Design a protein around this ligand. Structure first.
Ligand SMILES: O=C1NC(=O)[C@H](Cc2c[nH]c3ccccc23)N1
Ligand code: NA
Length: 456
C-alpha cells in the first residue's frame, strides 16, 4: 500500500480554492523576474507588440492545456505524482516524474537566487554588507517555512500581493515612459532589429515557460472547490470556469510585465528594469531603490513556493510515504534544489524554454489521452495507492508507455520549431493504439473503483 495522510486524495470538505482564488494565485504567480528576461531577449527577434502577442498566444495554449490536465485533480483531489502512475507504471511513472521534479527543482534554486540577490541588495543599500550565500540559505529557508503552511499561505499571500504587484507594475511603465518622454504606442514598435527566429517558436517559448507548471498543476488544483453532484455538462463548465480563471490570471499579469522586460531591453539595452529606470531617470533615492527590491522579493515569493516547490515535495511523500511527509519533502526539496546551484546554468532561457516544451509535450499528451480517451474519466483511486493492481503492469512499469514517449519525442525532432505541438499530438494519438494493445494483457478498469467515493 502506497497511501499516507499527505499523499491522500483531497476530500470535498477539505477543498479551499474556488475560481476567483485561482485567478488571484495565477496573477501573482505570473509576476516574476524570469519573464523580463524572456520577453526582453525577444526584442532581439521581434518588436514589442509582437512579443506581447507571442505572450498572449503562449498563455492561451497553456490554458487550453490546463483545461485538460486539471480535470482529474479537481474532480478527484489527487497528486501529479500519484496521477502519473496510471499510464506509466506505479514505479515506471517515477521516470518522467523524476525528469519533471528535477526541472521543477531547477526553477526553485533559480528564483531563490534572484530573491536572495534582492534581499542582499536591500541590506547592502543600508549596511553595505554584501554576503549573498547567507541570504540565499535564509531565503530558501523562509520559503520552506511558509510552504509548510501549504496552499493556505500561498492563497493568502497571493491575494494581497496581486494588487500590490499589479500597482507596482503599472507605476513602472509610467516612470519609464515619462522619464524618457515617450508615449506607449511609440515604444510598442521599437524592437526586432535582428530577425531570424520564426514567430511560432516565439509562442513556443512562452508555452515552454509554464509547461512544467501546466503539466503538473494537479498539486494546486486538487485543492479546488468542486460539486460532486454535477453532470457531464456541469463538470465541463466547471472545468471551463477554472480554465477561464487561469486565463484571466496569467495573461494580463504576464503581458504587463512581459512588456516591462521588453521595454527595458529596447530603451536601454537591458531587460532588468532596475538599470533601465535608474538610468532613464538618472539615479533614484535609497528608499525608492529598496522599494524595487521589495518588489522582486514580493514577486518571487508569489511564484517560487507554489510553482516550484510543491510538486517535488509531493513526489517524495507519495513515493516514500513512510519516509517523507509533505513538510519533510518540502525541506528535502529546498535543500536538493539549492544544491543543484542552477545559477551556473550556461546559455539563455529562451532555448531552455524551447528545451522544456519539446521535453514535456508528450508527457502532457499521454496524460490527457490515458484519462480522457482511453479510460473515459473512469478511474480507480483504490489501485493508485497499492503496489499491485491494474496500474502495476509489468512488475510496476508500463514499458509500452515509455516507448510511446520515446517515439513521440523522435517525431518531435522532425518539426523543430513546433516540436511540442507535434510531440503532444503524436504522443496523444499513439497512446490510443498502444493502450488498446496493453489492454489485451492488462485490465483498464477495476471493481474497487466503486470505493472511489470512500476516499472523498
Ligand atoms: O515551469 C516553470 N516554473 C518556473 O518558475 C518557470 C517560470 C518561468 C520562467 N521563465 C518564464 C517566462 C515566461 C513565463 C513563465 C516563466 N517555468
Ligand atoms: Na510572483
Amino acid at each position: 500500500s502506497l497511501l499516507n495522510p499527505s499523499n491522500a486524495p483531497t476530500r470535498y470538505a477539505e477543498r479551499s480554492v474556488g475560481p476567483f482564488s485561482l485567478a488571484a494565485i495565477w496573477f501573482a504567480m505570473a509576476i516574476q523576474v524570469a519573464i523580463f528576461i524572456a520577453a526582453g531577449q525577444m526584442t532581439s527577434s521581434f518588436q514589442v507588440w509582437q512579443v506581447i502577442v507571442a505572450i498572449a498566444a503562449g498563455c492561451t495554449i497553456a490554458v487550453i492545456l490546463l483545461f485538460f490536465t486539471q480535470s482529474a485533480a479537481i474532480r478527484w483531489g489527487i497528486n501529479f505524482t500519484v496521477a502519473a502512475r496510471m499510464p506509466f507504471g506505479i514505479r515506471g511513472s517515477l521516470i518522467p516524474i523524476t525528469l519533471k521534479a528535477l526541472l521543477s527543482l531547477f526553477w526553485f534554486g533559480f528564483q531563490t537566487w534572484l530573491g536572495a540577490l534582492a534581499l542582499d541588495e536591500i541590506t547592502r543599500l543600508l549596511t553595505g554588507f554584501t554576503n549573498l550565500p547567507l541570504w540565499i540559505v535564509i531565503f530558501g529557508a523562509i520559503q520552506v517555512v511558509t510552504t509548510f503552511y501549504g496552499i493556505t499561505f500561498i492563497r493568502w499571500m497571493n491575494v494581497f500581493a496581486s494588487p500590490v504587484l499589479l500597482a507596482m507594475g503599472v507605476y513602472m511603465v509610467y516612470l519609464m515612459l515619462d522619464g524618457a518622454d515617450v508615449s506607449l504606442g511609440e515604444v510598442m514598435s521599437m524592437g526586432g532589429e535582428n530577425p531570424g527566429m520564426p514567430f511560432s517558436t516565439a509562442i513556443m517559448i512562452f508555452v515552454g515557460g509554464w509547461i512544467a507548471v501546466v503539466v503538473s498543476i494537479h498539486d494546486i488544483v486538487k485543492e479546488c472547490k468542486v460539486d460532486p453532484n454535477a453532470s457531464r455538462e456541469g463538470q465541463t463548465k466547471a472545468d471551463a470556469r477554472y480554465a477561464t480563471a487561469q486565463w484571466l490570471g496569467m495573461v494580463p499579469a504576464s503581458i504587463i510585465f512581459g512588456f516591462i522586460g521588453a521595454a527595458s531591453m529596447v530603451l536601454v539595452g537591458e531587460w532588468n528594469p532596475v538599470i533601465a529606470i535608474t538610468e532613464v531617470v538618472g539615479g533614484v533615492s535609497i528608499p525608492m531603490a529598496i522599494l524595487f527590491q521589495v518588489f522582486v522579493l514580493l514577486a518571487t515569493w508569489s511564484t517560487n513556493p507554489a510553482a516550484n516547490l510543491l510538486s517535488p515535495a509531493y513526489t517524495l511523500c507519495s513515493t516514500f510515504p513512510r519516509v517523507f511527509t509533505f513538510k519533510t519533502g518540502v525541506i528535502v526539496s529546498a535543500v536538493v534544489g539549492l544544491l543543484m546551484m542552477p545559477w551556473q546554468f550556461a546559455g539563455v532561457l529562451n532555448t531552455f524554454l524551447n528545451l522544456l516544451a519539446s521535453a514535456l509535450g508528450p508527457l502532457a499528451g499521454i496524460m490527457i489521452s490515458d484519462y480522457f480517451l482511453v479510460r473515459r474519466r473512469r478511474i480507480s483511486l483504490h489501485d493508485l495507492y497499492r503496489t499491485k493492481g491494474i496500474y502495476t503492469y509489468w512488475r510496476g512499469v508500463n514499458w509500452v508507455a515509455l516507448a510511446v514517449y520515446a517515439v513521440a519525442l523522435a517525431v518531435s525532432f522532425l518539426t523543430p520549431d513546433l516540436m511540442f505541438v507535434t510531440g503532444l499530438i503524436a504522443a496523444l494519438l499513439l497512446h490510443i493504439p498502444a493502450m488498446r494493445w496493453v489492454a489485451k494483457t492488462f485490465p483498464l478498469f477495476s471493481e474497487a473503483e466503486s470505493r472511489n467515493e470512500d476516499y472523498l
